[PDB]
Design a protein around this ligand. Sequence first.
Ligand SMILES: *[C@@H]1[C@H](O)[C@@H](O)[C@H](O[C@H]2O[C@H](CO)[C@@H](O)[C@H](O)[C@H]2NC(C)=O)[C@@H](C(=O)O)[C@H]1O
Length: 435
Amino acid sequence: TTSSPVRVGLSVDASALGHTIPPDYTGLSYEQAQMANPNYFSGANTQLAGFLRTLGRQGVLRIGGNTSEYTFWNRHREVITPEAVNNLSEFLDKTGWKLIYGLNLGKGTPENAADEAAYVMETIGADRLLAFQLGNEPDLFYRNGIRPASYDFAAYAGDWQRFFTAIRKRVPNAPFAGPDTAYNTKWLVPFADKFKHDVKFISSHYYAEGPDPSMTIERLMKPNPRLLGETAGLKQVEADTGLPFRLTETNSCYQGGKQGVSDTFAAALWAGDLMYQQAAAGSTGINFHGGGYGWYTPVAGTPEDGFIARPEYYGMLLFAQAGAGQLLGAKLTDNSAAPLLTAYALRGTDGRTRIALFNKNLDADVEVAISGVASPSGTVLRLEAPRADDTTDVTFGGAPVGASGSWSPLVQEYVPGGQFVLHMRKASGALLEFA
Ligand SMILES: *[C@@H]1[C@H](O)[C@@H](O)[C@H](O[C@H]2O[C@H](CO)[C@@H](O)[C@H](O)[C@H]2NC(C)=O)[C@@H](C(=O)O)[C@H]1O
């Protein structure tokens, strides 16, 4: 219980049907440069394989990023070898995840892309390979040196066509996604119109940071009107072209994250909330960007030093433990003095109702009167840290994540209740499960 909480109502409507969350919704995004060491994405990397399994029995590993500008496949600047691709196959087998694989359109040749694609299709195979992507954020190639100032959608469409044609010559069944950029009208909308028969889905990026002492934990917990616009833009592309969308690179802040924001418990609330907000908008899935010890990485570490779950991971863990199923109406009322509380109701594939709550209010505890659920018993797992800016001390279900993504709940809490009352501290999260 909490001292002076904001008393809010949550009404679940099992008749207000939303989108069905696919089982491969979860995912991660990594740099292609990781493939320069064949021990990274390897059957031997049992620690990293463990972290991914805990995030989902199904999910998508996306490899790409700015380093796909300067990674170069060779059958014998970073170099990708057949051994790296062979090892990646074994990693996907250990995790059960599917692959989005970046090809080098920024600096590589169409012929080298077709050769790399052929080797990936030879070894990873059609079942595990979801899509190739032809360049990462082509709209920023100029910013990053890789094309001249005059490079525009028309030029990129020419490149894309040349690469597509060369690859399909070597790999007739090759699947593609694109354009692998932030939402925008000059690139993503015309990409969808022009290449709708040649791609499986639209690939777009999102950073809560816009174009700075102004990305703060306070700002990160607030609604992002730009995100709502971009998501609406993607749904209109889907209506116009039939192409579903996946958020294939996202994190709290770009340029590697912001110390004191991206590496904090607040990122767990942000990331868990984002996963549900995009799933409710009809996104097919998500891929949080990371690697190394970057401020925003979900999993930190290396094969030689070992891996650990960073705060953001715990947001993704809450989503993982909720599991898949159909989103339901979950209306909040009396909530104007706790406006950053979000709630998502889910009919699980196993038939049980779940509710994911993110109390993103930094200074208000809440007391949630839950109606519209008929159950003899509800339990809560809490997503907690002692302060919103904590870089550690994060737990879920009263336990940290251990080595190799090991996680089990250690604290059982019943929700008192044809209604239920749930207290939540300021800056906390909760997963409710009803028998
Ligand atoms: C998405 C890009 O694809 C991604 O590569 C960016 O991250 C990398 O590059 C930026 C800019 O140089 C670095 O600051 C990051 O540390 C890099 N991340 C990793 C994991 O190596 C990414 C971003 O800006 O953070 C997006 O632009």
